[PDB]
Design a protein around this ligand. Sequence first.
Ligand code: A1A9E
Length: 167
Amino acid sequence: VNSFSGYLKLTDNVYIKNADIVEEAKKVKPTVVVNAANVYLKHGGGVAGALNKATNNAMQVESDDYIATNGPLKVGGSCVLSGHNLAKHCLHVVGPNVNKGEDIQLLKSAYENFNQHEVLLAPLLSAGIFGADPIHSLRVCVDTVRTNVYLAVFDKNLYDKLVSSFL
Ligand SMILES: CO[C@@H]1C[C@H](CO)N(c2ncnc3[nH]ccc23)C1
């Protein structure tokens, strides 16, 4: 039993809701919140900008030190950093950004990072300004993630479209 509330069950291990991931994290304080990161951990907009702004820029400060030490992530890769006031940990995961010309095939690799954590509050990878088909991303999520994932989808029309089209 966990404290997530109001989620629609899609499969044994994937759940979904129309909500801001920042608000879900503020309420649940999950062990892991997933950030929709880029390779430079520059948290400029979307989920990343929202998470970072909710940390009063502490996420960005920590991320800049990470990059200075380790260099950029790989597309499809991840790193574990602090969750600051929102969660115990933040798993920064890089889905491909089609508006940058990044390879959409890497979306499965990106979701594989979720399997290293038993429970996660996560966004839909490569959605929004990353430019991928959200129906496909939800499909890849369900067909790749085996651990328990709670997907918070901010955009109401997107949530409704995803539910009505899910197979
Ligand atoms: C079209 O919106 C993009 C894609 C995705 C699903 O709507 N996004 C979010 N998902 C969950 N929490 C969020 N907080 C702030 C943004 C956000 C932003």
